[PDB]
Design goal:
The structure is cut from a larger assembly and holds five copies of chain A. Chain A is an alpha/beta fold and 347 residues long. Chain A has a single domain, classed as TIM Barrel (Alpha-Beta Barrel). The first copy, chain A, contains 15 helices and twelve strands. In chain A, strands 1-2-3-4-5-6-9-10 form an eight-stranded parallel barrel, surrounded by four helices. Chain A has a two-stranded antiparallel ribbon with strand order 7-8. The two termini of chain A are 42 Å apart. In chain A, 57% of the residues are buried. The structure holds propionyl Coenzyme A (1VU) (5 copies), oxalate ion (5 copies) and magnesium ion (5 copies).
C-alpha cells in the first residue's frame, strides 16, 4: 500500500489534485441504460430528472458489435445534456477487453469534466486499480480535467472478494463497491442462475417433530456474508457499498425485499435496470418513516448526544444517538428532493 | 506483530510479568453499572455476589457532566469492597477523549491490584492496543501492581472489524472482544436504532407461488457474520468472545434469544444492563441440561476419547468426544461456583 | 508465499513436476471407510464402483489400538484393487501424532502411484502444508512416484479458518478444503455435539406480535459464514470446497438439506460416512434437472454469451450466461459418468 | 500501517492537526546539554545563538539521582529563554523507564508550545511510536498545544534497524532518525567500546606479492545507507548521532563528512568544540556548490544534455546540483559568512 | 509467523518443550570434519577437547559414494565419545537431496540426545524451517529426546538473504546463521571462485592527482551487517562460515576478525591450523578487555557519565564494555592464559 503523503499526490503532471473526502449526495438509485439504443437515449434528460445517479453501460448486456456504438452514444448523450444534481457514471468494458483503452480515453477526452465516476467490472486485485488510477491521471492531465474522476469497483469475482481490503485502499479515487451477484455466483460456482434474491434450495430443516409431524424449512439469505463483508471493508476505508442488479424485473416484491436487506446492512443504494425499478430503489434506500420518527425522538431525548434515556422500555445512550443521527441525516438530505417525504419525516 | 521472545516481556521496569495463559473462571454475565449513581453504588456489594463479572462504566451512557463523578464513584466502591470470586472490569472512556488519561491512571493508582480487566471502547486498530499496553505497563510499574491488567477490546467500529486479527495479536494482555452492536450499527451505517436482536425488515422472501398470495418472509440474523468472525479471530488467538448489550431491557424473550444465538456460535458470555438481565445471561451461558447429559453419554461411550460409536442413530467419534468435553468442562467450572447448577449437572 | 517462479518446482530431486491445473473429474461424493474392518474391506471394490471418490480413514473414528491395522488395511485393499475412474484419497493422522510419519511413508512406498489425494486433518497454518509438501516430495523421490500426490486440507480449527488464505496459497499440491463441523465446533467452542445440520436454539425471534400472539422463531444456518468464506478462499486460489461429514446417518432428510446448502453456496461435494449417504451426495451435488433446463434456455437465448435477453420476466446477460454454463458444463460432465443424468438432462 | 485518511487525523479531540510536511529549517547541528547542571543551564541562551538545534538530554549520561533535576532544569531554562530561530528538542527517558511518563507530561504541560521535537531513545518498533503519538495527542489536547510535537527516533537497537520501515511510517509526527552508534554496537554485540568512527581491526588484506597492504573499511556504511533510504522514502530526515571521542576532531570531521555525503542532514554535538565541526561539515563545500552552479547554468531549464570538463550532465545531475545549491541557499540566509563564499 | 502462544509449543506429542532462551556457551570455533575418513575419526576425541563446537559434515565436500559412510561414521564416533562441554553439531544434506530424510532420522534415532544443533544447508525460506521443525518434533517424540535439537541455518542463497527475517522467526529451534560465501557467491553470480576474503578487482579508484591509488573494499560488508542485524533482532547468533584458503592464514585471520568486529560469534575451521585462528580472533583482544573493565569500574551502576583517557563514557559505553567483559569471563573460565591475560 502507498505511503499516505504519496497517496494524495497526482499521478501525472497536470492531473487534478486527488480528493480527500467523497462528495456527499443522494445515491439511492444507480440507473443503468444502454447508450446505443436511440429511443432510450432520447428520453435520457427525462430519466435523469428522476434518478440520483445515471450510469451508462458499455460492458455486459451490451452486444459485442454494439460496443463502439454504446461508447459513442454515451458521449453523444452526455454532451447534449445538463444533468444538474444527477450524478453521471459509466461502466466501461473489462481491463482485458479490446474496448477498454478507447472507452476510457475517448470518454475522458470528450466529457471528462462531466464524468463523476467510472465503474470498472471484474476487478480482481489492487493492480487493477493501480492501472486505472495511473491511466486516468495521464488522460486527465492531457485533457485538462478540473477534478478527479472517481473509481467504483464492481465486486463480482472470488478474487475480488478475497482481495477486498487491498482493492479498497489502492487509490484516493476509490468511491465504493457494487455487489454483482450474477458474475460473483458464476465465479464462485454458486449453483444458481438467479441474480440476487432468495433461493428455495437454501434453508435450514427443523428437527423431527413431536409425532411424525411435517418439518419446517426456513429459507436463508445467500448474500449475508458477502454484503456484510463488503460493507465492513468499504466503510472502514471511507467508501460506500451498493447492492448491484436484481435480475427478476417483474418480481417487484422480491426486488424490494432484496433492496431492503442491503439497506439494513448498510448499503447506500442499488441499481435499477428498468423504469419500474427506479421508484423501488428510491423508496427502499430512503429511511422508513417510522424509523425516522423514532430516531428524531432519540435525538430530542438526548440533545447533547451524551448520557442515558429510556424510550418505550428500550435503553438509549450516546451510541443509539449516533444511530439515530445516521438515519436522520440521510432523511434530511432526501427530504429536500421529495416534498412527500419531508411531510412524512417532518424534516 | 512483536517477536515471540519479546511478546511476553514487561513493557516497563517493575511492571508485572505478562501472562502466558488467561485466568480460568466463569464469565457468563458481565454486569454493567453507572458508578456515579449513589443508589446503585450502595447495592454494588450485594449485586457483585450474583454476577460472574462486574464492570463499571465510564463511557457511553454516562453524561459528560458526570464523567469525573463516575470515575471517582467506581474507585470508591472498589476500595471499600472485597469482590471475592467476582471478576472486576471497568470500561474507560475512548482513547481520543479528555477523560481517558485520568480514567486509567487514577484507577490503577487506587485499585490496580483489584482490577482484572480494562475494557477499551471504540477500538480501531493494533495501535490502540499498543498505546494501552505501554501506558498500563508504566502505571503498573509506578504503583507496583502485582498482576497484569488485561485488555478487553470493545468491537464496535468498521475499522475494528477489518483489523480484528491485528488487534487480537497486539498484546499478551488481550483477554477478548465484546460485540457492541449499537456503535457498530452507527459505524457501518446499518439502518436501525435497535441494539441487537432481530429486525422485521431483514428477511428472505419466498418465491412467488402462482395462484397463491402468501409469500413467506423468513427473518434473518443481522449479526451472523459479525459474531462468527469475532469468535474465529478471538479463539484462534486464545481469547474469548462476548455478546455485548441487548438494548430492549423489557423484552426478555428477545434478549434470551439473542443471548442464546451468541452462546451457540461460541460466545463465552453477555453483558447485563439491569438486574433483570442477570439471570438471563447466567441461564443462557450455562450449558443446558440435556446438552450436558448427551455429552456425558458421549464421554462414556469412548472413555479414552478415541474410536467410533453410534448413539440414537448418530455417529460419535474423537471429535464429538471433544465437543462433549467442551460442554462438560464448562458445566463443571460453573457448578463449582453455582450451587443450583451443581446439582443440576453433577458435582 | 513462495515466488511464482519457484512455486512450481519440485521440492526434491526425482520428485514429479508439480501440477499446474487440478485434474478434472467428478468429486460429488467422498466415501469414507475404516480400513481395519475386514467385512468392509472385502466390500470396498464393489463400493468403489458407486462413488466418485473413495477415502480411507486413519484418523478420528479409528481407535488407537487399530491405527496400525487401519494403515495396513488401507494399503492392502489398495494394492489388490484397480479403482478405475474412482479417485483414491486417504486421511492420515494429525501432524502431531505418533502415527503420521509412518502413515505417509508406508502408503507412498506401497501405493504412492495409486494415491490421488492425501487429506491432512486439524490444519492450523501454512507451516503445516510446508511440512507435508516437503515430506511428500522426498518420499516421491525415494519411490519414483510419477505424479504429485495432492494435499486436501481439513478445515476444522479456528486457527485454520483465520489462516485460510495462507494455507490455500502454500503449495501447488493444494486440492481444496473440507469443512469438518465436529472438530471446528469443538475448536470454536460452538455449544453443540451435533455434526452439521441446524440447531433449534439458533434463530431470530420476531417482534411482539399483537394481542400477544405467539412470536415466530426463524431458525438460522450455523454454517453460512464458514462455508461462504471457505468457498471464496478456495475458488480464488483455484481450489475446491467440500462439505465434510453429516453425523446423523439416519436423518437422510436433514442430510440432503445440509448437502444442498453446501452445493448452492459453491461446494463441489460432500462426504458419505455410510452407504445410504452415497446416493444422497451424488443426487445433491449434481445440478437439479430444472436448474439445467432453465440454464439451457439461457445459453440458447444468446449462444455467444454476449448481449441481453428477457426470459420469464428475468433479465439475462453475459454473466447469467456464465452462471448457466457452470451448471450445464457440470451437468454434461456427470452425465457421461452417471447414466440416469444423460437422458434426464 | 494506518489508512491514509486516518493517518492525518488528530488522535485526540482538541489536539492540533497533524502536519503534512516537515518544517523547513537548518538542522546541521543538534547540540546536546545536561539540564541539571546549573552552569550549563545559565549559559544556554548564549549557546543557542550558535546552534541550529538545541536538545536537552534526560536519558543516558544523566545519573539516576539527577533525572528529576534534569527534567526541572530543562523546563526552567526553556520557560525563561526565547530561542528564536533555534529549534528546541528534548531527549526523554526510555519507554520502559520510571521517568518517561513524567518527562513527557510535565514538559508538554509547561513548555509544549515551545517544544518542536521529542527524541525517543531505544526505539524497537512501530508500537513504540503508536504509544508516544497517542500519549502526545492527549497531552496536547489537555494543554491546548497549538502545533504538533514531532517524534525523532533514536536508532540504536538491532530490532529498531530491522523494523526501520515500520517505525518510519507509524505516525505523521515522525521527523527522522539519529544513529546511536554506542547503544547500537552494544545491541548488535559489535566488539568495540568506541562511539562512531573507524576501528583498526576492520579491513581487507591484499593478496600476497613483501608486505601486504591492509585497507580499513567503514563499519557504518550499511547502517547509514539503510537509515537514509528508509528515512528519505518516508519524507523523513536522517542524522548521525554522537561522536564519542570529543578530542579527536579530525576523526569527528571525517565521520560527520561520511554521513553528510551519504545523505544525513546533520549530527549531534556533545561539547562546544564539536559545534563548528558539525556546522562546517553539514554545510555544502564551496567547490561542490560552485560546480553545481556550473551545472545549473549549462542546464537553464533542467532538461537535456551537456558536457563539462569531460563530464556529462543531464536532467538528473541538474537535480543533484539543485539539492546542493538549495541547501547552500537556505544556510546562506541563516549564515552571512557562507552567503558570499557561496555567492548566494 | 506463528502466534506467540503456539510458537513455544512442541509440534509433536512427546517432543520436548521448545527452548525460551539459547544455551550459553563459547562458540568461537565451529570445527568441520568428514566423518567417513577413518584416520580423522580416530582423532576426534582429541580434537573435541580443543574446540568450542564440533560439526560433522555430510553435505558439500563429501562425495556422493561416501554420503552413507559419512552418516554412519558420524553416528559411530558420536556413540563412542563423551564430548563434555564441547557442542555437537551436524550439517546434514540439503532438503531436496536423496540423503536428508535418513540423515536426520537415523542420527536422531541413534544419538539424538547428544546432538545439540543441526545445520541445514541451502536454506531458501521459512518453509524449509517449518519442515525441519515438524520433522524433528516427530522424531524427537518417537525416540524420547529430552531436549530440543536446535536449527542452524546456513545462509548461502540469494533467496535466503532476501527471506532472512522470515527464516529467523520461523521457529523456537532457531540457533543462528552461518555465512556460506562459496554457495552465496555462486547463487548471486558474484564473479569469483574464492571462498571469503578480499578480491583485488573490488576497489575504489582515487581521483587523478601521480599514479591513482586504489583502495580494496570488503565484498561481504552488506552481507555480514544484514545477517548480524536480523540474527540479533531475533535473539540469534551470526557466524562467519568457511575461509577456503587454508594456507593463507593471514587472510583468514583478517576475514575472521572483520566478522568478529561486526558482531559474529564465531567462525568455521576446516583444518587443524584454522582452529587456533578462530579461537584467537573470536576471543576479545586484551586491550579491549582491560579498557572495558575501566569503563565498568568508572560507572559501577552503569548510570551517568565519565571521562577516561580523553574518551567520554556513559550508560551506552558501559553496556558495550559489559558485552566485551562478559564474553571474556566465559572464555577465561576454560582458558587460564586468557584468564591471566585478561586478568580474570
Ligand atoms: C446481471 C449482470 C449485469 O451486468 S446487469 C447490468 C446490465 N444490464 C442493463 O443495463 C440492462 C438494462 N435494461 C435494458 O436493456 C432493457 O431494460 C431491456 C432488458 C433490453 C428490456 O428492453 P424492453 O423490452 O424495451 O423493455 P420494456 O418493453 O419493458 O421497456 C419499456 C420502456 O422502458 C424503456 N426502458 C427499458 N429499460 C430502460 C432503461 N434501462 N433505461 C431507460 N429506459 C428503459 C424502454 O425503451 C421502453 O421505452 P418506451 O416506452 O418504448 O419509450
Ligand atoms: C448501547 C451502548 C452501550 O453503551 S450499553 C452499556 C452502557 N449502559 C449501561 O451500563 C446502562 C446501565 N443501566 C442503567 O443505567 C439503568 O438500568 C437504566 C438504563 C438507567 C434504567 O434504570 P431503571 O429504569 O431504574 O432500571 P430498572 O427500573 O430496571 O431498575 C431496577 C432496580 O435496579 C437498579 N438498577 C438499575 N440498573 C442497575 C444496574 N445496571 N446495576 C445495578 N442496579 C441497577 C435500579 O436502581 C432499581 O433499583 P430499585 O428497584 O429502585 O431498588
Ligand atoms: C465426525 C468427525 C469425523 O471424523 S467423521 C469421518 C470418520 N468417520 C468415518 O469414516 C465413519 C465410517 N463409517 C462407519 O464406521 C460406519 O458406517 C458406521 C458409522 C459405524 C455405521 O455402521 P453400520 O451401522 O453397520 O452401517 P450400515 O448399517 O449402514 O451398514 C450397511 C452395510 O454397509 C456397510 N458399511 C457401513 N459403513 C460403511 C462404509 N463406510 N463403507 C462401506 N461400507 C460400509 C456395513 O458393514 C453393512 O454391510 P453389509 O450389508 O453387511 O455387507
Ligand atoms: C554515547 C551515547 C550517548 O548517549 S551520547 C549523548 C548523551 N551525552 C551527552 O549529552 C554528553 C554531554 N556532554 C557533557 O556532559 C560534557 O561535555 C562532558 C562529557 C561531561 C565533558 O565535560 P568537559 O570535560 O567539562 O567537556 P569540555 O572540556 O568540552 O567542556 C568545556 C566547557 O564546556 C562546557 N560544556 C561542556 N559540554 C557542554 C554542553 N553540552 N553544553 C554546553 N556547555 C558544555 C563545560 O561546562 C566546560 O566548562 P567547565 O569547566 O565544565 O565549566
Ligand atoms: C567451501 C564450502 C564448504 O562447504 S566448506 C565446508 C566443507 N568442508 C570441509 O569440511 C572440509 C574439511 N577438510 C578436509 O577434509 C581436509 O582438511 C582437506 C581440505 C581435504 C585437506 O586434507 P589434508 O590435506 O589430508 O589435511 P592436512 O594434510 O592439512 O591435515 C593434517 C592432519 O590434519 C588432519 N585433518 C585435516 N583436516 C582435518 C579436519 N577437518 N578435521 C580433523 N583433522 C583434519 C589430517 O588428517 C592430518 O592428520 P594426520 O597427520 O594424518 O593424523
Ligand atoms: O455485472 C454485474 O453486476 C453482475 O455480474 O451481477
Ligand atoms: O458500546 C456498546 O456496547 C455498543 O455500542 O453497543
Ligand atoms: O473430522 C471431521 O470431519 C470433523 O471433525 O467434522
Ligand atoms: O545514545 C546514543 O546516541 C548512543 O547510544 O550512541
Ligand atoms: O557451505 C558453505 O559454507 C559455502 O557454500 O560457503
Ligand atoms: Mg457482472
Ligand atoms: Mg459503544
Ligand atoms: Mg475432525
Ligand atoms: Mg543511546
Ligand atoms: Mg555451501
Amino acid at each position: 500500500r502507498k505511503l499516505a503523503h504519496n497517496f494524495y499526490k497526482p499521478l501525472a503532471i497536470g492531473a487534478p489534485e486527488p480528493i480527500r473526502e467523497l462528495p456527499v449526495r443522494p445515491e439511492r438509485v444507480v440507473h443503468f441504460f444502454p447508450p446505443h439504443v436511440e429511443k432510450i437515449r432520447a428520453r435520457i434528460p427525462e430519466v435523469a430528472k428522476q434518478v440520483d445517479v445515471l450510469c451508462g453501460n458499455l460492458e455486459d448486456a451490451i452486444p459485442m458489435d454494439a460496443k463502439e456504438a454504446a461508447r459513442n452514444g454515451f458521449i453523444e448523450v452526455v454532451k447534449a445534456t445538463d444533468f444538474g444534481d444527477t450524478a453521471l457514471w459509466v461502466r466501461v468494458n473489462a481491463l482485458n477487453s479490446p474496448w477498454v483503452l478507447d472507452d476510457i480515453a475517448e470518454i475522458v477526452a470528450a466529457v471528462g469534466n462531466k464524468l463523476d465516476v467510472i465503474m470498472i467490472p471484474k476487478v480482481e486485485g489492487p493492480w487493477d486499480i493501480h492501472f486505472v488510477d495511473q491511466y486516468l491521471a495521464l488522460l486527465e492531465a492531457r485533457h485538462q480535467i478540473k477534478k478527479p474522476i472517481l473509481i467504483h469497483a464492481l465486486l463480482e469475482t472470488a478474487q475480488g472478494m478475497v482481495n477486498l481490503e487491498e482493492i479498497a485502499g489502492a487509490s484516493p479515487r476509490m468511491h465504493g463497491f457494487s455487489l454483482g451477484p450474477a458474475d460473483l455466483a458464476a465465479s464462485r460456482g454458486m449453483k444458481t442462475t438467479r441474480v440476487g434474491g432468495g433461493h428455495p434450495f437454501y434453508g435450514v430443516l427443523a428437527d423431527p417433530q413431536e409425532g411424525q409431524a411435517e418439518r419446517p424449512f426456513y429459507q436463508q439469505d445467500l448474500w449475508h456474508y458477502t454484503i456484510a463483508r463488503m460493507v465492513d471493508v468499504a466503510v472502514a476505508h471511507g467508501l460506500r457499498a451498493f447492492y448491484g442488479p436484481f435480475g427478476d424485473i417483474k418480481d417487484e416484491a422480491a426486488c424490494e425485499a432484496q433492496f431492503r436487506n442491503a439497506f439494513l446492512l448498510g448499503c447506500t443504494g442499488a441499481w435499477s435496470l428498468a423504469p419500474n425499478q427506479i421508484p423501488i430503489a428510491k423508496r427502499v434506500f430512503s429511511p422508513d418513516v417510522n424509523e425516522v420518527l423514532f430516531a428524531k425522538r432519540i435525538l430530542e431525548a438526548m440533545p447533547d448526544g451524551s448520557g442515558v434515556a429510556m424510550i418505550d422500555g428500550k435503553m438509549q445512550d450516546d451510541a443509539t444517538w449516533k444511530q439515530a443521527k445516521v438515519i436522520v441525516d440521510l432523511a434530511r438530505m432526501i427530504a429536500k428532493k421529495d416534498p412527500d417525504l419531508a411531510q412524512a419525516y417532518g424534516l
